[PDB]
UniProtKB/TrEMBL annotation:
Organism (species): Caulobacter vibrioides (strain ATCC 19089 / CIP 103742 / CB 15) (Caulobacter crescentus)
Official protein name in the record: DUF952 domain-containing protein
UniProt superkingdom: Bacteria
Lineage: Bacteria, Pseudomonadati, Pseudomonadota, Alphaproteobacteria, Caulobacterales
Pfam families the record matches: DUF952
Length: 114
C-alpha cells in the first residue's frame, strides 16, 4: 500500500540534505508525520495546500515502514497513516512536482492513478 506526503520543495530539499524528513510544522507540533492513503490524498491536498506553488508529492510504501506507522481513525472516520518517526529519504519510492488547478488546488489525480 502506498501512502503520501505533500510538502514544499524547500522542505524536501532540506530533508534530502539531512537524509530524512523530520516533518512539517504541523507534524512536529502533533508528534507524528501526517500522511494520506491514496483515496484520501486529494482531499488532503485541497484542504491544506491551496495556492501553494512548488509542492512535491512523496509516494511511500507503507508495509516496510514497520511498527512506527500507525493507522488512526480520523477525518470522516477513515484511518490515516501516521508515522511516529522521521521519514527516511530512502523510504520514498517516488516523487513528483505538483501543479495547481484553476481553484489553486494541487492536482494529484494522474499521480495517484499510477
Amino acid at each position: 500500500t502506498l501512502i503520501y506526503k505533500i510538502l514544499s520543495r524547500a522542505e524536501w530539499d532540506a530533508a534530502k540534505a539531512q537524509g530524512r524528513f523530520e516533518g512539517s510544522a504541523v507534524d512536529l507540533a502533533d508528534g507524528f508525520i501526517h500522511l494520506s492513503a491514496g483515496e484520501q490524498a486529494q482531499e488532503t491536498a485541497a484542504k491544506w495546500f491551496r495556492g501553494q506553488a512548488n509542492l512535491v508529492l512523496l509516494a511511500v510504501e507503507a508495509e516496510p515502514l514497520g511498527e512506527d506507522l500507525k493507522w488512526e481513525a480520523s477525518r470522516g472516520g477513515a484511518r490515516f497513516p501516521h508515522l511516529y518517526r522521521p521519514l527516511l529519504v530512502s523510504e520514498v519510492t517516488r516523487e513528483a512536482d505538483l501543479d495547481l488547478d484553476a481553484d489553486g488546488v494541487p492536482q494529484l489525480g494522474d499521480h495517484l492513478a499510477l
